[PDB]
Amino acid sequence: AFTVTVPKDLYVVEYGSNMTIECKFPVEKQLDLAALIVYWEMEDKNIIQFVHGEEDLKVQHSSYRQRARLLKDQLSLGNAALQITDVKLQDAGVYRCMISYGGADYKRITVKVNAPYAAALE
Amino acid sequence: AFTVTVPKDLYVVEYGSNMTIECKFPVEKQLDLAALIVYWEMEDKNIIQFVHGEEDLKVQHSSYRQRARLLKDQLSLGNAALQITDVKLQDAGVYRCMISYGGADYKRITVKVNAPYAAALEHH
Ligand SMILES: Cc1c(COc2ccc(CN3CCCC[C@@H]3C(=O)O)cc2Br)cccc1-c1ccccc1
């Protein structure tokens, strides 16, 4: 039975650092990327749309331009891992990874950003 | 390209009534039940899961208990509509119809609920 699992449904991270958030899906043999769809989003806001072997960078929310990537080697292990670099306060909230690979499921991940006083300022 | 489509991405409904919320996907010649997943949910609460060829209520949020149906019958025709009965004020918000069938897509629908003062005065 196809499910997506997260080893951590919550991450606490420091402002400016990098994070990698992970969804696991079953891969028993050679990854068939023609059958694989990985979608990552924070709102509403798209971060990854990986259909049949490539990103659709076209549709990615501006706020994730070049700070966000899916580690494609990790995919072969059944690990859709989104790495975000240079973490901002705006990156805090609910993420969703949706994966389809002979089955379909998704999981929710919550990200908290701790920041020093200097950084938090409106 | 695989796309889920919604005729109406806004519904307005009266407290106490039933509502049917439409969502459509393309079928080829035959529906392969085994490759169709449908999830309906609202604000990250599962309303319904259709996996394999069965309605699956395993993660159903209690709020929706016994008030939600998707018609197996109509899946053949590319129709994945959700039927909510006895609409509450707490049913208002953003719904998502998520569908894997060969490809994968989801679309959002906003639901507004009108109610009279007695019902609004839930309140508490
Ligand atoms: C819904 C889903 C997906 C959905 O993937 C997509 C969702 C939307 C979209 C649409 N996308 C949105 C941003 C703008 C560009 C583009 C468009 O509108 O043409 C693409 C994918 Br892939 C992927 C993997 C699994 C599931 C799934 C399906 C059923 C149950 C559990 C998960």
Residue numbers in the entry:
A (entry chain A): 18 to 139
B (entry chain B): 18 to 141
What does the paper say about this structure?
We show that they act by directly binding to PD-L1 and not PD-1 and effectively dissociate a preformed PD-1/PD-L1 complex in vitro. We further show that they inhibit the PD-1/PD-L1 interaction by inducing PD-L1 dimerization through PD-1 interacting surface. Not only the inhibitor partially covers the PD-1 binding site in each PD-L1 molecule within the complex, but the interaction of the two monomers fully occludes the PD-1 binding surface thus preventing the interaction with PD-1.
A single molecule of BMS-8 binds at the interface of the dimer in a pocket almost identical to that found in PD-L1/BMS-202 complex. The disposition of the buried part of BMS-8 is identical to that observed for BMS-202 and the only differences are observed in the part directed towards the solvent. Overall, the binding mode of the compound and geometry of PD-L1 dimer are identical in the structures containing BMS-8 and BMS-202 save for detailed interactions of the solvent directed moieties. The fact that crystals of PD-L1/BMS-8 complex were obtained in different conditions and belong to a different space group than those of PD-L1/BMS-202 strongly advocates that PD-L1 dimerization reflects a specific mechanism of action of BMS compounds rather than a crystallization artifact. PD-L2 was characterized by a comparable melting temperature as PD-L1 (38.2°C), however, neither BMS-8 nor BMS-202 significantly affected the Tm value (38.6°C and 35.6°C, for BMS-8 and BMS-202, respectively). These results further confirm the interaction of both tested compounds with hPD-L1 and indicate that BMS-8 exhibits lower affinity compared to BMS-202. Differential scanning fluorimetry employed here to evaluate the BMS compound selectivity between PD-L1 and PD-L2 demonstrated that both BMS-8 and BMS-202 are specific for PD-L1.
